[PDB]
Design a protein around this ligand. Sequence first.
Ligand code: MG
Ligand code: MG
Ligand code: MG
Ligand code: MG
Ligand code: MG
Ligand code: MG
Ligand code: MG
Ligand code: MG
Ligand code: MG
Ligand code: MG
Lengths: 224, 53, 87, 13, 213
Amino acid sequence: NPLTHSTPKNFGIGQAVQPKRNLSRYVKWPEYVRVQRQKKILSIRLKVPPTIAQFQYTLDRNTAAETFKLFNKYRPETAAEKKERLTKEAAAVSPKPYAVKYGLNHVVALIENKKAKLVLIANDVDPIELVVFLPALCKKMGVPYAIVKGKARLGTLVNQKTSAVAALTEVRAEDEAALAKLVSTIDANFADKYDEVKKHWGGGILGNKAQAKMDKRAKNSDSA
Amino acid sequence: QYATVSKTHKTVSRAYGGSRCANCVKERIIRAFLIEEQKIVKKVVKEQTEAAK
Amino acid sequence: MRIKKKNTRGNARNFITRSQAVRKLQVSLADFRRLCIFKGIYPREPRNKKKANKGSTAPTTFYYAKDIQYLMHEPVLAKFREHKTFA
Amino acid sequence: KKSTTSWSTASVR
Amino acid sequence: GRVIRNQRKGAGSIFTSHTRLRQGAAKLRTLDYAERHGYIRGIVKQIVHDSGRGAPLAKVVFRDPYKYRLREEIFIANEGVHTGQFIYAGKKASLNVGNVLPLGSVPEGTIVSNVEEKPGDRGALARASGNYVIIIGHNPDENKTRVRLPSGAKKVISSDARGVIGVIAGGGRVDKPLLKAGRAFHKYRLKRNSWPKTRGVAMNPVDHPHGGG
RNA sequence: UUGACAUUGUGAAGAGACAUAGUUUCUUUACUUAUUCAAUGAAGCGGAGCUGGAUCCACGUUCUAGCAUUCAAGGUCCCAUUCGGGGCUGAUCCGGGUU
RNA sequence: GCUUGUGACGGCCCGUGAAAAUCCACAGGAAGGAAUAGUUUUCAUGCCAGGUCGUACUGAUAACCGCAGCAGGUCUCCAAG
RNA sequence: GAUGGGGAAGCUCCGUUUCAAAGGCCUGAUUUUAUGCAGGCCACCAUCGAAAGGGAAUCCGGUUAAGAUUCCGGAACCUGG
Ligand SMILES: [Mg+2]
Ligand SMILES: [Mg+2]
Ligand SMILES: [Mg+2]
Ligand SMILES: [Mg+2]
Ligand SMILES: [Mg+2]
Ligand SMILES: [Mg+2]
Ligand SMILES: [Mg+2]
Ligand SMILES: [Mg+2]
Ligand SMILES: [Mg+2]
Ligand SMILES: [Mg+2]
């Protein structure tokens, strides 16, 4: 094609106008976005006491999937089907129901009375003092507990937007073996595995540039 | 009042007619041609010096 | 009276481009096209396209501003919004 | 005929 | 006691600067990528007089590196700079009068002006007519430069601080007697309300502590 | 103007106390995350390139009062060729810090 | 010749002696546009419209201020032999 | 001299573009997942402040008891469409 020519552009200093580039790293974000990002960074940077740092150790993907598979079969009654029961009871005038127990005060009382077979505790609770005492209480009362990721996930479990805690108290005969196997799996994967590591302080991480500077200083001091 | 007259009264028939005068237009034409020729010469000289070095 | 501004009256107010019509209707392009088909809104050709588009000769689809303003009151638009909420 | 509210239709094509 | 003029001047009022006829604040370019890494060329379009300032100023036009347009800067004219001259500003700029260079890139004994106190403040030292800053030495380990100021003081500043090669134009201004209260009047009319001055001894003890007798 | 207390956090080294398992006290030396100062168009910061040339550099800009802007031309894979439209490159990668 | 406008100049400064609305032009060429038909409303002609508020008079040894129809005070333009 | 902010028990004070998510425009049959908007571009601050500064365009003759570059007659010009 004789009509087309190659005319490269010089994008060096003192040259043609700079082209458009991805400046996402230099975006002046809104103040709420900046606040939340810096808050998460600060939580990473500061040295975290172990009682708070224990909530960063949660169930793995496979165990969490098995747990929620068990709990979704006991997902509580919705308001639409409750009216179907009340009309049926009015015509007669119902069996014993099985459902996931939820609500912070109710679950804490169940743990204190040793009625809860298994407890799931959401890790992203703000304020954290609502659940920061739950692992120690479960350990003292001998109630199997597991920290899981997602109060929204527990809310979908109990037909809410969010839920700080979920509890399985009574189960059917077709699921007692599954519940016992899940309790043993959580004991092997979460309690015994994270027993030592949850006693340590967290958040011992530097920033990127600080880590690079420390590495360069260590390399220079070790070798010229 | 320049909005009321025709384009003949506000221009002359030359490049930069109006905004710039004839001598300045001539000087910038000369400068453009000579500097472009010098740029070609300098690029050829730099390529030859890179090859010889 | 003070001197009026150009490109505000005449063709510039009589005709409105498709992008401006969509922006004023606050709908998507697909919804706008379906509404135009339902209501029988059809593109128009100004006699002075440079006057209608501020001296640009670029190809543009124009509509009547009164037609778009009448289209603003169609209940099918509210039905579309309700369907979006339902989805 | 006349408008009572700020947003009216009055149905004239 | 009554408030003296020295205390009165702090409230502003009639003691503010007369700035109607000023050309604009005299500053270097903002320290950007081009000046940090390479250099950038501008052109001296005109050299103008600034009301209330002894030294002339120079309008220098650069090209915007990130947009197709022109940027006009107001520099303090060094002696020897002319209209149509090319000015180079950056770390890689040459050692010629009128160029803007970091202090770490010039040798000892270099004479500069409009010197940054900190890297990026766009000129703070040796701005009046006839004044200059002398580059005494360098400390590469701390990335510092020792300089001598017009008052005779010795200072240590960053090697990334910028300065303009040469001496500020318009020197020798104060060697001419004014001869006239009228010429002093026209001098301070373009600066501020600090003339004429009344002696404290000539006042009353209420007006000034030096008053009375 | 001077001193104390609170804001006030995290390490390393050397000296003390439970009587030679690490729980605290005092000096020195570091760090950043609180706090403080400044600037901008929060545009090029930090690290690395089996990137190249010779630990350092971009060999992309210095006779000249010119000019530099339309997702960038070109190169290479497709499309369904038709007025053209997409991808990689041109213009290296990574970062949880606008400088 | 008087008054006044203006032009090319010269003298002066350590004094070098406003801003903005607004208007035009240039550089650029995204585009659009003809063969039996197009283009050009910066050429001429033809058509329509221009809202609100002020508008008399004195302006001084009597219309302003000075308790007054007070020898005081109060900015400016034109100007014959 | 407001707003965004920050002081002050408070009446209110600072500051005038900062310390703000402060608003406009272009294209689209977005390779269709079937009735949900996708791809882009440019960017800095309210308002008040001159009947002597800046500024679109009108003149002549006649007419009243008192109006007059405004009315009447004739002849023009500007702005917007
Ligand atoms: Mg006396
Ligand atoms: Mg009158
Ligand atoms: Mg009169
Ligand atoms: Mg009176
Ligand atoms: Mg009185
Ligand atoms: Mg105020
Ligand atoms: Mg005003
Ligand atoms: Mg006037
Ligand atoms: Mg009269
Ligand atoms: Mg008339």
